[PDB]
Amino acid sequence: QVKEVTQNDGTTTIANNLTSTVQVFTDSEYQLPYVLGSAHQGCLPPFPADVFMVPQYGYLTLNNGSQAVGRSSFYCLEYFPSQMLRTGNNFTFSYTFEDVPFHS
Amino acid sequence: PLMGGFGLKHPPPQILIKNTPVPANPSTTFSAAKFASFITQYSTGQVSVEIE
Amino acid sequence: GADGVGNSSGNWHCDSTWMGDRVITTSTRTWALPTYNNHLYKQISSQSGASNDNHYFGYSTPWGYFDFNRFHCHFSPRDWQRLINNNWGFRPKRLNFKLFNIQVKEVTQNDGTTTIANNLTSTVQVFTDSEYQLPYVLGSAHQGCLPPFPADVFMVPQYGYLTLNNGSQAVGRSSFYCLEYFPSQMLRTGNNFTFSYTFEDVPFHSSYAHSQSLDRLMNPLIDQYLYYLSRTNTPSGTTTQSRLQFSQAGASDIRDQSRNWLPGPCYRQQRVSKTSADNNNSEYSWTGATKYHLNGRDSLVNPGPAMASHKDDEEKFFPQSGVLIFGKQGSEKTNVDIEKVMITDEEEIRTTNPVATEQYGSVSTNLQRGNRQAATADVNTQGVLPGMVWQDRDVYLQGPIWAKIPHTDGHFHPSPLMGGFGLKHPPPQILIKNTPVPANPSTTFSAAKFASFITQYSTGQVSVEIEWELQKENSKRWNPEIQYTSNYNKSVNVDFTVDTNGVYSEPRPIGTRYLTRNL
């Protein structure tokens, strides 16, 4: 569900925006810088009653000092196919782990 | 991996999510510039993960 | 397809796929449409004492329209590089157009506060003409095309056209088109719009440059069997008597060899230099420009016929109007300095086409005789002759894709001047309008037309998918080609990338001619 907020004076009213959409995609071809596994915050909370904020996505590339190098890549996330979800739509996918040794 | 856990050559893919921009009250005359004005909004819902 | 209020009418598709015969480019953008002219047609005309050349008469309409006609809409700078480096030619085949996730917003301005609320029952009405019954605006290189960078939201441009005029006054033949008069699909929130289109068969664009020139198409090792006049007079040693002699042309004199073809046609240009010191100090922007003349009004020929911009090592100079000039990101409309514009350069055409700033050649003026010396004249403008060959202007990255050949008794070599594909039946225009919603009519009846409407605008997504056909490069050249390469050196910002403020920019024009074919 998508909520529009209107801040006027000190009062802020939060109202349903029914026609707005949210767009979601999973890359699954591994075409983006893979952030996960760097032990960043923003994971689902330990305790199920918690509500959590979704973290922002950003990545790093080649650099010399703070200056970029010609090989540094720029990825536009708007450039991938993504499902657009309005209120009353859902998103799913399933995944199968490749064969991996047991943890001891 | 060094931090511990399972090295995966093809790990679980990333799921990226965005609020689609909604412009706010464009001018009546045409302007080729990009919009600096949007409706302020956020979204919420539930997420469910099942691992075997 | 008709969904509810809460269902999404279509998914975001922005993609590029390469099947190696074909590439299919898809792009999706977000648009915002206001209400133009307060829901009413108007006539517009040249203002007051405007010069004879500037008079116009036409109409502005409430309708907006969509134009994807620029290449960079469809191609990313990297997608453009696979095509430009690896291919001799490309043309479009069929395209598809889809509108979805429409939503209409009413805005209420009271005091300083303005609240924007969903209007669920309002509609948007859209039609594509497809019979070409309207003035065709596209292909005039107007702004308002889909943005280059997919994260941008763009305003939909207003639709207007021009007709016959005398001064600013209309002529009896001038036509008035009411866009309300065509069948149009009306879209409420939860409806979508689609159509598909198939390009008529068109010649490939040539993305290749020649490795030979017309002047030098022959074996240097072997002499011709055809004589020319090597000399016209022989000395007696007191004086030179007139005796005419002949020679077979060979490696020694190449310029005299009999040649079987001619360069393309020229319409001459004035030459200006990028270094501010070399240019003359006078106002010749107009009085010195090259022009054509219709119905008593001159018009600058900005694009011109396709010509090389400069000869060897002239890179400083460029034709006055003869090139396409793009502005850098954040450039003002008027009187902007040379550093802001990006000037394209056609020099890859030197082989088959004349330099735009110099004459086609020289021509004998008079008949010589013993008592009078022969004389010649310069030909500054040359129409087509039998046995002439030429190359068309290059399309670049941000140039237009196509244009509509006017419907006329005859036309020669329909390829457009700005570059791109001449299409007799181009992609139709898609026009879009916010349906008027009256506001609180009076309780008593009045036959007058409503001056009061709810103020509202609409927004949604638009998706364009074009299928392109590729012509692969098969060549026996031993040594490496020239490729388009992003420079390896370090920089503050990356080319074709957002800056620290989020402003996307294109550093240079990218034209499509790199790979080399022999002539």
UniProtKB/Swiss-Prot annotation, chain A:
Uses, biotech or industry: AAV capsids serve as viral gene transfer vectors that have been shown to affect long-term gene expression and disease correction with low toxicity in animal models, and are well tolerated in human clinical trials.
Record localization: Virion; Host nucleus, Host nucleolus
Domains as described in the record: The N-terminus of VP1 is sequestered within the mature capsid. It contains a phospholipase A2-like region and putative nuclear localization signals.
Family indicated by similarity: Belongs to the parvoviridae capsid protein family.
Physiological role: Capsid protein self-assembles to form an icosahedral capsid with a T=1 symmetry, about 22 nm in diameter, and consisting of 60 copies of three size variants of the capsid protein VP1, VP2 and VP3 which differ in their N-terminus. The capsid encapsulates the genomic ssDNA. Binds to host cell heparan sulfate and uses host ITGA5-ITGB1 as coreceptor on the cell surface to provide virion attachment to target cell. This attachment induces virion internalization predominantly through clathrin-dependent endocytosis.
Misc. comment: The ratio at which VP1, VP2 and VP3 proteins are synthesized in vivo is about 1:1:10, which is the same as in the mature virus particle.
UniProt-recorded name of the protein: Capsid protein VP1
Taxonomic source organism: Adeno-associated virus 2 (isolate Srivastava/1982)
Residues of the full protein shown: 319 to 422 of 735
